[PDB]
Amino acid sequence: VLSEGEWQLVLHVWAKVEADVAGHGQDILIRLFKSHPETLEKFDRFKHLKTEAEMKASEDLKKHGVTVLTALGAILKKKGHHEAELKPLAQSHATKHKIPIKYLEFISEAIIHVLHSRHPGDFGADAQGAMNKALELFRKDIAAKYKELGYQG
Ligand code: HEM
C-alpha cells in the first residue's frame, strides 16, 4: 500500500497534469504508439495514423487522451480505495477491447516519461518512485479482475 506521504507526492504532480489534460493526454498516447507500435493496432479509431505529425494533428486522438487521463485521475484520487472505479475499466479492457496486462505496463512507462518531461521540479526520484508504486497498484488490481474473468494475460 502507498503511504500517506507517497499518495501526497502522486496527487501533487497530478494537480499539475490537470492544468493541461489535453496536452498531457496527447503526449502520452503518442509516446505509447511510437514505443510499442503493436498498441496502435488495438485502436480501429487511430490505426490509420502513420507519422508522429499525423498523430499530433488528430483531434480525435487528443479527445481520447482526455478520456484516458480523466479516468486515471478519478482512480488516483481514490488513493487505493478504487474498487468501484476500477472494475468497469478492467471489465471493458479485458472482454471488449482485449487489452493484455503488458500493454497497461507500457502505458504506465509512457505516463512516467511524460511526467518527467513536463514537470522536472515536481517529479524527482521520490515522486517518480511514488508514481511507479501507484501505477503498479493499478495494474495489480486490474490483473486480479482479469484473472477472475479468465483473461490473466
Ligand atoms: C491508464 C490506462 C488506461 C485507462 C485509464 C483507459 C481508459 C479508457 C476509457 C475510460 C475508455 C472508454 C470507456 C471504456 O470503453 O472502457 C477506454 C476505451 C478504450 N481503451 Fe483504454 N484505457 C487505458 C489503457 C488502454 C491501453 C493500454 C489500450 C490500448 C493498448 C487501451 C485501449 C482502449 C480501446 C481500444 C478503447 C476503445 C476506444 C474507442 O472508442 O474506439 N486502453 N479506455
Side-chain angles (χ1 to χ4, degrees):
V1 317
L2 279 76
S3 83
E4 194 61 56
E6 285 161 336
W7 276 119
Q8 197 158 14
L9 293 164
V10 170
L11 287 175
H12 182 69
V13 70
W14 199 262
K16 314 228 169 230
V17 168
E18 291 188 333
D20 177 16
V21 177
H24 277 83
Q26 258 331 256
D27 285 353
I28 287 163
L29 292 173
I30 291 170
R31 177 52 137 103
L32 176 66
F33 293 157
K34 292 206 67 91
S35 298
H36 295 275
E38 78 273 28
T39 65
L40 185 48
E41 240 7 81
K42 283 290 176 182
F43 291 93
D44 278 36
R45 253 159 93 183
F46 301 127
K47 230 157 28 188
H48 63 287
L49 297 151
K50 293 301 146 42
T51 65
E52 169 159 16
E54 296 174 351
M55 285 176 188
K56 274 176 164 61
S58 177
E59 192 76 358
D60 197 50
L61 187 43
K62 173 173 188 194
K63 170 167 186 349
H64 193 66
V66 175
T67 296
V68 170
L69 289 201
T70 290
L72 182 57
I75 286 164
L76 292 177
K77 289 172 182 182
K78 285 296 201 322
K79 298 158 78 184
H81 296 99
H82 52 223
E83 50 275 323
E85 293 74 15
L86 190 133
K87 102 110 100 258
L89 199 83
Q91 306 187 146
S92 70
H93 280 59
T95 75
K96 172 168 42 140
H97 303 314
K98 331 269 27 155
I99 303 301
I101 293 295
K102 160 127 298 212
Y103 291 11
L104 303 177
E105 183 185 0
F106 295 148
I107 198 166
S108 297
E109 288 162 15
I111 287 171
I112 286 161
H113 179 90
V114 172
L115 292 186
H116 180 83
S117 315
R118 282 198 174 233
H119 310 282
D122 278 298
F123 204 59
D126 13 52
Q128 196 200 359
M131 185 60 69
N132 190 69
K133 288 191 224 80
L135 295 175
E136 303 193 313
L137 176 60
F138 166 73
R139 275 203 304 266
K140 178 203 119 235
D141 283 349
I142 289 273
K145 274 29 106 203
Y146 270 44
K147 182 167 178 315
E148 179 194 342
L149 283 177
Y151 294 78
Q152 192 66 317

